[PDB]
Ligand binder design. Structure first.
Ligand SMILES: Nc1ncnc2c1ncn2[C@@H]1O[C@H](COP(=O)(O)OP(=O)(O)OP(=O)(O)O)[C@@H](O)[C@H]1O
Ligand SMILES: Nc1ncnc2c1ncn2[C@@H]1O[C@H](COP(=O)(O)OP(=O)(O)O)[C@@H](O)[C@H]1O
Ligand SMILES: [Zn+2]
Ligand SMILES: [Zn+2]
Lengths: 561, 474
């Protein structure tokens, strides 16, 4: 049947009862969504060595032994590993990091040795070392003798098993840097899998999976919830569902008596979740994945960036052709460009342009905001530049977008970034984009060949670009029929995109104020031109004249060279 | 040797080493995983699991399981080393030949050939687990000696080893018969010339080996009757007082060192002789229950280089001093205080011997199970060296014992009266019989399927001459 199982028959094949009821394991591939690529990689690394070993023997190679798997907490790493272990239908020995590190002296090593030996005995086997960072942490932080002993025992076992064995070790850790570096060489956890925050489709799939048993009301717009939920890992979505259910219970508490031990089934029949409950849960949700760098997924095309056609085609030639057409580059033996740096007034749409470029080649996107760089400079952040670039390598192809790079490039961090960039593999298609507002202040060492040598100026939007930006920003906002924005666009000469968004914000704020006043007095479904006129009257350019003059002078000077 | 050493030991050790002893366990209620796959609580229990023992009231870990623990702890297969031998007996004798540049010990000693401090600590593996007496008569007659005479006794015990299921990979020593050496027993003690005793025991051991037995221990009685009208004895040996005084421990250690256990996993090939010592003193009540003990490996190697001697305090062993040809380093005996903390106390003046013992468990075979006794005997012909009592082996005793049955028949009765240890030894000393004649005698007396062998024996000329002389003698 299914899940290696061989109405009663359908239930048995999954096509006292408490033990299985609370042990609802065997979470197969149908209990995971939004991680199709990572799941495919894990399946390739695991099932093939165990299911069909004859292939590798026929070719005459040794399949990988260790499979490291890291990502933000709450992304389902342990769930994915358990699903793989159950689906492969092969012996597998659990090891929970804290559990092994929570025993009398001289017994943690005993448990590790017993695990490895037993997994060896019943090959094929899958040893799942969970929270490996808690038993083999970074050398400097844990100077305890017992920790060193356990790390050495684990290293000895890992090295000593790679001999005609069908044992595959799968590990889970929050970050690639926490683990001791000694566990990332040949014959060890060499192949690594990075897991990032899901995209809109991933969140929709997660909601579909979790909201299958809940008695939802017919008035649910799960697509809207998926669109609104940004930066939510699977755990946060489960928390959202739980909060919605609790809100429904609280609403229904009026028709129920706390003191009564029994609860009428008729009331329970009316426990229907509503969109309002989900919105309230969003209100009470506390996502935290974005607090640290994570491999995101962007889906912006060449329509959310107005004008700048020359810049768009230049970026295409610089980025897409290598990735899309490597054969021509190999024929001509030309190494593709390794980076590019954007300079210009703030708010001109550099981040959106970089996200669009990343989307074009269908590659993952990593963002490193300036505050994170400063935090790493002060050395009070969990992540690190080496960690960022290691995750970029693992999730290749990727676009790493350093933001507010002026602050660090007025030293340790700059030198470390230079070392990482130099050490990067040229052939591998990983690009580094930079955003800044003080091109002169940027350290010249960065702009050397083999680094962010490409310089791209991002000018202020023109009339057509301003009109396109206005049309884009008002896509989600209702507007009065027959409303023209050309007048606003022409009247907004010299304004940046941020200023246009601010004007839209002010106009909509006035409209909502009018609606609130009218409702309180008791009508305002549309936005009249008066709102925009007043907002423009209460708006001003955010770019100083002197800065614009110096930027244009710098651009001309660079062009002369 | 590029691998395991090559040497032959008893069959029991081989069969034990064949097994694994893994104790299976079922799905605990604490497991969170599918049917297949085991986390930390469903894994098979190793045979040396300390918790399992102390939970089952087993105090030591059945040496073979200790060997399994040591092999698992190290010796990775196919790589990582070239098989460093896991077991090695202690040796405290100072290396007379070190020569970093210094001369022999008497006039020079470096820091490389200086016996480091010795840390006594109670042993954890007992080589032989269960000492088992085939028939209670074996010890009943031994005690009867003291009953009649009143003086103490002492005797070696012959037998053979076998498996013992009740303990993980455990061994039992089954004793078939007891042999008494010539001793000058007294009221408070006993005395026996060592040289003559060993000279006699050499040939007695040769004959016993010819019979298939082997020397597996010494048993002596420490019994003193109380004033009660019926049979009651004071319990001088219990937790309050000593279990085995220093002298008995010394003698047991000497004997153990003189009967090495040949093993395949040591540099020298031997380790921790299987030689149980039993003592009879009486439990807290008036019974005459027996006990068993075995000195730890350190005490075995601590007395080869002298370094221990008896003390007026029964439970403490005095320590000797340094001198040429004998270097005695500081001795620390490590106990655990009531707060669960290990404490090292220097004991040069004297230390308790309870750190130089491991206890066994005596017993008797179930009285309704299979009887594989070699000898249906121990009530008949007088035992060997009971000259002091009226007992005296001689021709007229044989005439009174095995003449009426021999002259008529009753091959069942003849067999039951012919499978006696001491009778066989005495008729062997008679030398009336030829070598192969005595071989067939023993094969008829100490074996099943004995019809044709006994018929051959009687048909022989030697037996005819023996019965003729028996008839001639009064
Ligand atoms: N596709 C999915 N991705 C992420 N989480 C999922 C997914 N489907 C379901 N979930 C739920 O999200 C939560 C993930 O928790 P889980 O313990 O697997 O995360 P983790 O951070 O990888 O764990 P660990 O503590 O072992 O590091 C669980 O509630 C799981 O049921
Ligand atoms: N073509 C465009 N030019 C300028 N701004 C744009 C354009 N398209 C969209 N925007 C808006 O400009 C803002 C840019 O924000 P951000 O990228 O943080 O600053 P910067 O543009 O300085 O990098 C976005 O909020 C976006 O809505
Ligand atoms: Zn389990
Ligand atoms: Zn020396």
């Amino acid at each position: 049947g299914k899940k290696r199982k061989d109405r009663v028959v359908r239930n048995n094949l999954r096509i006292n009862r408490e033990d299985e009821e609370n042990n609802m394991n065997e979470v197969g591939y149908d209990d995971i969504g939004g991680c199709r690529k990572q799941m495919a990689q894990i399946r390739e690394m695991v099932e093939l060595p165990l299911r069909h070993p004859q292939l590798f023997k026929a070719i005459g190679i040794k399949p990988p032994r260790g499979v490291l798997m890291y990502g933000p907490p709450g992304t389902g790493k342990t769930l994915m590993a358990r699903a793989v272990a159950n689906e492969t239908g092969a012996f597998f020995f659990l090891i929970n990091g804290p559990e092994v590190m929570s025993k009398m002296a001289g017994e943690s090593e005993s448990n590790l040795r017993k695990a490895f030996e037993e997994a060896e005995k019943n090959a094929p086997a899958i040893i799942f070392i969970d929270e490996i960072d808690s038993i083999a942490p970074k050398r400097d932080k844990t100077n305890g003798e017992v920790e060193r002993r356990v790390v050495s025992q684990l290293l000895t076992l890992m090295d000593g098993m790679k001999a005609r064995s069908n044992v595959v070790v799968i590990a889970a850790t929050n970050r690639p840097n926490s683990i001791d570096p000694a566990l990332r060489r040949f014959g060890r956890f060499d192949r690594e899998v990075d897991i990032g925050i899901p995209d809109a489709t991933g969140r929709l799939e997660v909601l579909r999976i979790h909201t299958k048993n809940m008695k939802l009301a017919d008035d649910v717009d799960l697509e809207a919830l998926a669109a609104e939920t940004h930066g939510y890992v699977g755990a946060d979505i489960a928390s959202l569902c739980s909060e919605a259910a609790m809100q429904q219970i609280r609403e229904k508490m009026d028709l129920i008596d706390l003191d009564e031990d029994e609860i009428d089934a008729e009331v329970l029949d009316s426990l229907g979740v509503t969109m309002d409950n989900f919105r309230f849960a969003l209100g009470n949700s506390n996502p935290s994945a974005l607090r640290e760098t994570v491999v995101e997924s962007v889906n912006v095309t060449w329509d959310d960036v107005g004008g700048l056609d020359e810049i768009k085609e230049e970026l295409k030639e610089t980025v897409e052709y290598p990735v899309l057409h490597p054969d021509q580059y190999t024929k001509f033996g030309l190494s593709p460009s390794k980076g590019v740096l954007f300079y210009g007034p703030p708010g001109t749409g550099k981040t959106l342009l970089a996200k669009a470029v990343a989307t074009e080649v269908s590659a993952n996107f990593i963002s490193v905001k300036g505050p994170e760089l400063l935090s790493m400079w002060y050395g009070e952040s969990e992540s690190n530049i080496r960690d960022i670039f290691d995750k970029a390598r693992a999730a290749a192809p990727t676009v790493v977008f350093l933001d507010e790079l002026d602050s660090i490039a007025k030293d340790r961090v700059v030198n470390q970034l230079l070392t990482e960039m130099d050490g990067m593999n040229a052939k591998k298609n990983v690009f580094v984009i930079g955003a800044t507002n003080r091109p002169d202040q940027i350290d010249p060492a960065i702009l050397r060949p083999g680094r962010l040598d490409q310089l791209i100026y991002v000018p202020l939007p023109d009339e057509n670009a301003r009109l396109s930006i206005l049309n884009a920003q008002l896509r989600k906002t209702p507007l009065e029929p027959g409303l023209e924005l050309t007048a606003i666009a022409k009247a907004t000469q010299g304004f940046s995109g941020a200023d246009l968004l601010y004007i839209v914000q002010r106009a909509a704020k006035y409209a909502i104020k009018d609606s609130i006043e009218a409702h309180r007095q008791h009508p305002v479904p549309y936005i009249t031109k008066e709102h925009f006129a007043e907002a423009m009257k209460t708006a001003k350019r955010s770019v100083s004249d002197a800065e614009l003059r110096r930027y244009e002078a710098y651009s001309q000077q660079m062009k002369a060279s | 040797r590029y691998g395991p050493l090559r040497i032959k030991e008893l069959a029991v050790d081989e069969e034990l080493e064949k097994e694994d002893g893994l104790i299976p366990r079922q799905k605990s209620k604490l497991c969170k995983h599918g049917d297949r796959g085991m986390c930390e609580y469903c894994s098979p229990l190793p045979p040396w699991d300390k918790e399992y023992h102390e939970k089952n009231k087993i105090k030591h870990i059945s040496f073979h399981s200790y060997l399994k623990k040591l092999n698992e702890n190290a010796n990775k297969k196919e790589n990582g080393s070239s098989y460093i031998s896991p077991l090695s007996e202690p040796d405290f004798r100072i290396n007379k030949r070190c020569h970093n540049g210094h001369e022999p010990w008497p006039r020079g000693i470096c820091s490389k050939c200086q016996p480091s401090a010795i840390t006594l600590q109670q042993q954890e593996f007992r080589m032989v687990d269960h000492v088992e007496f085939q028939k209670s008569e074996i010890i009943n007659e031994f005690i009867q000696a003291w009953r009649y005479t009143g003086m103490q006794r002492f005797g070696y015990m012959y037998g053979s080893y076998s498996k013992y299921d009740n303990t993980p990979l455990g061994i039992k020593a089954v004793v078939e018969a007891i042999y008494e050496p010539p001793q000058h027993d007294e009221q408070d003690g006993l005395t026996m010339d060592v040289e003559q005793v060993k000279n006699e025991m050499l040939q007695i051991d040769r004959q016993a080996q010819e019979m298939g037995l082997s020397r597996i221990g010494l048993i002596f009685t420490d019994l003193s009757d109380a004033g009660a009208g019926d049979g009651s004895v004071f319990c001088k040996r219990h937790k309050d007082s000593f279990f085995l005084s220093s002298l008995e421990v010394i003698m047991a250690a000497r004997h153990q060192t003189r009967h090495p256990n040949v093993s395949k996993y040591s540099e020298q090939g031997f380790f921790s002789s299987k030689f149980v010592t039993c003592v009879i003193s009486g439990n807290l009540e008036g019974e005459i229950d027996i006990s068993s003990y075995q000195v730890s490996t350190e005490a075995e190697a601590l007395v080869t280089a002298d370094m221990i001697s008896g003390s007026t305090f029964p439970s403490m062993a005095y320590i000797n001093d340094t001198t040429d040809e004998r270097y005695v380093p500081e001795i620390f005996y490590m106990k655990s205080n009531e707060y669960g903390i290990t404490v090292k106390e220097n004991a040069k003046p004297a230390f308790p011997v309870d750190y130089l013992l491991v206890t066994l468990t005596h017993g008797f075979p179930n009285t309704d199970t299979e009887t594989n006794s070699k000898f249906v005997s121990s009530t008949g012909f007088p035992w060997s060296n009971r000259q002091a009592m009226g007992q005296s082996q001689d021709y007229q005793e044989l005439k009174k014992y095995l003449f009426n049955v021999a002259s008529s028949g009753d091959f069942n009765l003849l067999h039951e009266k012919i499978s006696n240890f001491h009778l066989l030894l005495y008729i062997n000393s008679l030398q009336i019989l030829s070598p192969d004649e005595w071989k067939l005698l023993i094969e008829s007396a100490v074996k099943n399927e004995w019809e044709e062998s006994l018929l051959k024996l009687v048909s022989s000329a030697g037996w005819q001459t023996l019965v003729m002389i028996l008839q001639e003698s009064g």
